[PDB]
Amino acid sequence: MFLIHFVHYKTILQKYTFKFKHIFLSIDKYNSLFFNISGILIWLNIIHINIILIKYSFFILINNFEYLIILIST
């Protein structure tokens, strides 16, 4: 048995904020310093490709993993 018909009131006001970042916002990524590259010399026992525009400006980088490559003013 019921007697009174009434409207429904609810306090949907949370008035609160909860922010928690996920790990994928923190997982590291590769970053590097960039400079205007002035050419690459790919050297081997005999064969060497030589792509150079201008001379070295400040410093010269060397990578030897598959092909010995010297980047000039990179």
Binding site: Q14, Y16, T17, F18, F20
Partner: protein, 103 residues
């Protein structure tokens, strides 16, 4: 009474239009009813529902996440949860009335 009901309908339709409430297209689509085109910087029912879910997410009490001491002492939402005794409450009230930085 008619004006009261009309005002209620006006309020609800204004809220729905402002928040993008309701379905986007027909009830039954070719691939399903849950197909919406979330335009950038446009409010939507899916966005408000996602916001509420992300904020609550099986939350029992606001203090449920407050097991970590840094979370407990963070005062981003407020400082009510850090007052646990009438002495502290009255001291804070006295200092704020005096016009000093709250401890």
């Amino acid at each position: 009474r008619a004006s009261r009901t009309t005002a209620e309908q006006q309020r609800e339709e204004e809220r729905a239009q402002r928040f993008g409430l309701g379905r986007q297209g027909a009830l039954v689509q070719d691939g399903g009813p849950d197909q919406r085109t979330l335009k950038k910087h446009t409010n939507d029912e899916r966005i408000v529902d996602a916001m509420l879910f992300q904020q609550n997410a099986y939350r029992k009490t606001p203090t449920d996440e407050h097991w970590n001491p840094y979370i407990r002492r963070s005062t981003e939402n407020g400082v009510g949860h850090l007052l646990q005794n009438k002495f502290d409450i009255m001291r804070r009230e006295d200092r704020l009335s005096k016009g000093e930085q709250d401890l």
